[PDB]
Nucleic acid binder design. Sequence first.
RNA 1: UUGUU
Length: 175
Amino acid sequence: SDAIKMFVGQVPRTWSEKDLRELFEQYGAVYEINVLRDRSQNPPQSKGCCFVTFYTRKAALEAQNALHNMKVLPGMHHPIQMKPADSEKNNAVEDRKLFIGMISKKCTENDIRVMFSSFGQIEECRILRGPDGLSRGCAFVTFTTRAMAQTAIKAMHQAQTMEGCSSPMVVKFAD
RNA sequence: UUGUU
């Protein structure tokens, strides 16, 4: 597939980029390797992990299947751990999710879904509830794209006041 | 009691 950067743990601290390139190129064409380093004192030192960027997702997956939880590198007591790098995380849910405040305590997950469905696809919707299942009068709504979240905000923030609520509905990005 | 993942 398209290019992807993988995070790899349980790499010997003594290994350099050259050693890693050789390992990974068995599975696919590597774009570039970056050993994570600690420069807190002299000399800089490997943190025992690296980033490897493959040209294709297919290559990354094949390396993962071959290595992750499978191959134990020299001196290690645990096998390679391999997963997409944090830098590759894209639609963080955190930046797609709305806090909805000042909703009626009678409001159901379905009610909220229905109120906010016109603005996009809702991947998740949860009413916050206390111990006795009583609504805390708020919800989280996750859209699939933050863009749909921003649109719901503009349209729905303080647009109405619901039953029993002291102020209009609150619609904003969640903490 | 405006209650946040």
